Ligand binder design. Structure first.
Ligand SMILES: CCCC[C@H](NC(=O)[C@H](C)NC(=O)[C@H](CCC(=O)O)NC(=O)[C@H](Cc1ccccc1)NC[C@H](CC(C)C)NC(=O)[C@@H](NC(=O)[C@@H](N)CCCNC(N)=[NH2+])C(C)C)C(N)=O
Lengths: 124, 124
């Protein structure tokens, strides 16, 4: 990946998720749009994009906090496989994880994912 | 500036702010800490580190929405000069703005002054 910081355009990307849980779900693979968030410790998919059938459990800390304050957070129970699509077509490396889900206004890939993809923010 | 993204520790820089306004201030220059934030569109200095004796305007829209809800903002009257000292004291390029001011848990270097530093995310 390579993506110049532009104040006007948010570092937005195409992401395909895939529930790999040995257990049925209506749709194993979905499609979303997700901001690349460096001030985001964690990767959290909004509840309005999380499938009503993909199970969830307790996240270790009842909520996540940000600007306005804390927002309730639950965690993925199955391992989702997260795959990133670069603007031009190409595919970034597949990473697996148990995401956090909450009423986020946007799905954000936090520093845990950013790190897996091998991302350094640079002006060099 | 070339920060490799870890989930581990945050993209934090130590900054310098100078009130370039033609009016007395107690202290013109202050050192603060800040996080590099691609998910944030504006730079927002904490009410905590803002020497509240640098006037503000309630200007724009009391933005500051994030996963929390909304929070009031002010924006600096006087153009502020902002400098990114990296680990060595070597400063980056001086930027000039009118940061937004709110009760942010941390000072954010948003994309605007993030594209002014030339920062871009990459793994190539
Ligand atoms: C015991 C510790 C366990 C770990 C757990 N960690 C957290 O809660 C941590 C601190 N939270 C975070 O990392 C959260 C994201 C949630 C998450 O990943 O968990 N990050 C954040 O909230 C960061 C900023 C931040 C940085 C440091 C500290 C606090 C906040 N902001 C993310 C957020 C995303 C955006 C799409 C709405 N951006 C904003 O809040 C910025 N807002 C904007 O740029 C607006 N102008 C436009 C967005 C609104 N509209 C919309 N979305 N359609 C603002 C900073 C200028 C905890 N502490 O409970």
């Amino acid at each position: 990946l390579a993506m110049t910081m532009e104040h006007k355009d948010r570092p937005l990307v195409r992401v395909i998720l895939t529930n790999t849980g040995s257990h049925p779900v209506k749709q194993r693979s979905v499609y979303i749009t997700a901001l690349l968030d460096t001030g985001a410790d964690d990767t959290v998919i909004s509840e309005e994009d999380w499938p009503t059938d993909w199970p969830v459990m307790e996240a270790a800390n009842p909520q996540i906090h940000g600007i306005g304050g804390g927002i309730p957070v639950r965690k993925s129970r199955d391992m989702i496989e997260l795959g990133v699509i670069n603007r031009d077509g190409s595919l970034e490396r597949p990473l697996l994880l148990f995401p956090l889900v909450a009423m986020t206004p946007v799905n954000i890939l936090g520093r845990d994912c950013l790190q897996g993809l091998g991302l350094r923010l640079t002006n060099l």
